[PDB]
Symmetry: C8
């Protein structure tokens, strides 16, 4: 397909939601190529909105998938290395697909000199930096 076809776009959203990657989806019978999908996205806000929803769902699906990829890895050096690459790629992508949920989490205990208060000295500007 080249022309925008909502039924096809809807199927793409459903498959992505389940965790399937776009390039893999686009290899299925009757699907548009990825370039065409991105063109559809660019010109159709209805699709963009549903695709954004599908991306959130895709991330939640992948989050479960990474446990399976690790736990079921064939215990052969090259196969484990591949499983690691697949998991690392998904971890990286999840943080971008939903930063609030899957971004890194750090608690910073902020203290000052010698574990006392943070010491701050303010002074008049000494150069023209405005």
């Amino acid at each position: 397909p080249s022309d925008y076809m909502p039924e096809v776009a809807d199927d793409i959203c459903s498959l992505l939601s389940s965790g399937e990657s776009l390039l893999k989806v686009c290899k299925r019978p009757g699907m548009p190529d990825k370039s065409t999908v991105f063109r559809w996205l660019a010109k159709h806000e209805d699709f963009r909105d549903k695709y954004a929803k599908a991306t959130e769902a895709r991330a939640d699906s992948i989050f479960e998938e990474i446990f399976e990829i690790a736990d079921n890895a064939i215990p052969d050096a090259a196969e484990v290395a591949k499983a690691r690459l697949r998991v690392d790629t998904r971890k990286w992508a999840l943080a971008r697909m939903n930063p609030r949920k899957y971004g890194d989490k750090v608690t910073n205990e902020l203290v000052g000199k010698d574990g006392g208060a943070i010491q701050i000295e303010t002074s008049p500007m000494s150069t023209l930096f405005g």
Copy 2:
């Protein structure tokens, strides 16, 4: 089973809470598939919340799993690499399941130039 069912959802939460993963909970007979569970979650805030707490319980179980996976790894190169991948995947996931509890922990001692006070100029 596609239509939201408050009893099946409560059941899912109980299973997750006892350490079971979503994939296993859904592979059971009569259970909704993963896509359906996620849809339920999306369209019901009450399920979203109990599921969130079940997720924190799941995390506490996974935390104890990582010790076993590491300590009981088969001492063969690929099996140890696999165990490492299993543990690393769980560590990463734990931080997201309960950030307060399992996120990274850093203490930053903030000082200024040469260990003096932090120097600020404002316009």
Copy 3:
């Protein structure tokens, strides 16, 4: 056991305090399974409090253990890799068991442009972000 049994809970706390992991404890004669332990925790504040104390002690015990795991590792590739995994897992866990004591430690010397003062310019809000 399924019913809450304080004497058993107390033994669990003592074993954890010495550095033993929960799943290993739960394999000992007469112990509840881990699911049951977590259920006991959920419903009994007396146990939760003692378990929190035991977790602090567990961390201090593990902190000593990591030296032994490294120093006594069998000098075989796979055994050293396993020892490393065991130590890395403990290091990660210790920071969560007692963040104040075992979290990362960084001293940040904060300076500004060209090693001078930190330059800050404040301006009226330019969008509605309140």
Copy 4:
């Protein structure tokens, strides 16, 4: 072709937008070489901007590429190492092509000593 041409430049943007890299776009017959494209960019702000947006489109294509490179890696030691290098190079590049979208994501919970309020003294 050395002299700036508004149509060839628009063409380059369209090709980059469809996922094609600059090296490939320039290896085509009748196209400017890379050095010439960069010169054009330097001396025309209108091209700089459309090129920037084409770069963001390229990034969205590359994002989907990394899944394929990882999942379809040949399970041989060197081929997996190569796939890892290909993916790592793309991840790094993506952050620079669209920082808002593909940069690192961190949530920092900022607290003070012992989990109390952050303590500050000022002069």
Copy 5:
């Protein structure tokens, strides 16, 4: 020996101070086991403090150990990996034993957009 003893505790501190680990101190005849030492520490603030300072002394000894472990590693793959693990474990531990001395050290030059002043808007 289970009951707190101020002389045995002072002894433990002296031994730790001279570089000896707790495991070794406790494996000695007549010494309390590790669990008992930790209990003492928990229920006596005076011991907690002298133990903390003995821990800083221990850290200074360990700091010099890492040079020896690295420089004198047997040049065999697994022995070097073991030496690396021994050193990495000590580096990590040192930061926690004396954060001021052995924690990470970073100098952050903080600037604003394009190297200008840091731009802040407040409500």
Copy 6:
């Protein structure tokens, strides 16, 4: 050449702009050695300015090059390791050649205790740190 020669300096800038490294450039017929190039830079502002422009262009050229080095790596352990070293070296250098463009990119969502507001307590100075 030892004496500053603008035509040669100009050629150096052109080659660097295309992504070639300085030491490689200095091996070409008729080029000065690197020490001499740095001496020319030190004493000639016209060259320094053009060299700075060339460095920006060099970085943009290298940014494209890293894809090719990775994608075309010979699938042999040592050759892939070399390709990785070549790419990692370029990534590191690019951030220094143009920090604004090629530096690391992080979005920090800043929150306070328990995900609420950041809690700040100010107090009079308690030591002489001015």
Copy 7:
């Protein structure tokens, strides 16, 4: 030696200044063991002061040494791994011996939402955190 001996302490400072590690120094003819050195340090401020100076010099010496360890490594897998360990250990230690000089160096360009100004909203305290 057990008793504090300034001439010996002075020699220790000179050897450390040249980059030699303490345990290696203490193996030389007539030197005290490390425990004794630390005892001398604890009780003699003259030695502590000179030892601190020696530590600064030691760091500058090691900074040059790391180039030699890397560049002269025997090109054998295990020997390169050992050289790497020796260099990594020194890099880590240098930052602690002289944090101002050998600590990590980062320039953070701080911007706000969408690359605009950093947006800050202040509010009355909503809990008792003073």
Copy 8:
């Protein structure tokens, strides 16, 4: 040669400036040993400064060296590992020789909860 000599020191700076390391400069006949150079530096501020600038020049030379070391690595496992160590050591050193130029570069987009404004409460 132990006594500070202003001409030998200027010479050292010139050599370092041309890319030569201190070890090589000192292994030359008639030159002070490393310990003596460091002593000079300690007791003369004028030498400390010219040496600092010579160090920045040295850094600019080393920056170009890393490209050659990487690109010309012998494609053998241990030789590539050695080249990597040589490059990594230089990268680390460069940041300390000229922090402004060769330190790490990060752009931090600072936002508040949920991408809103950063929320602060003060006492």
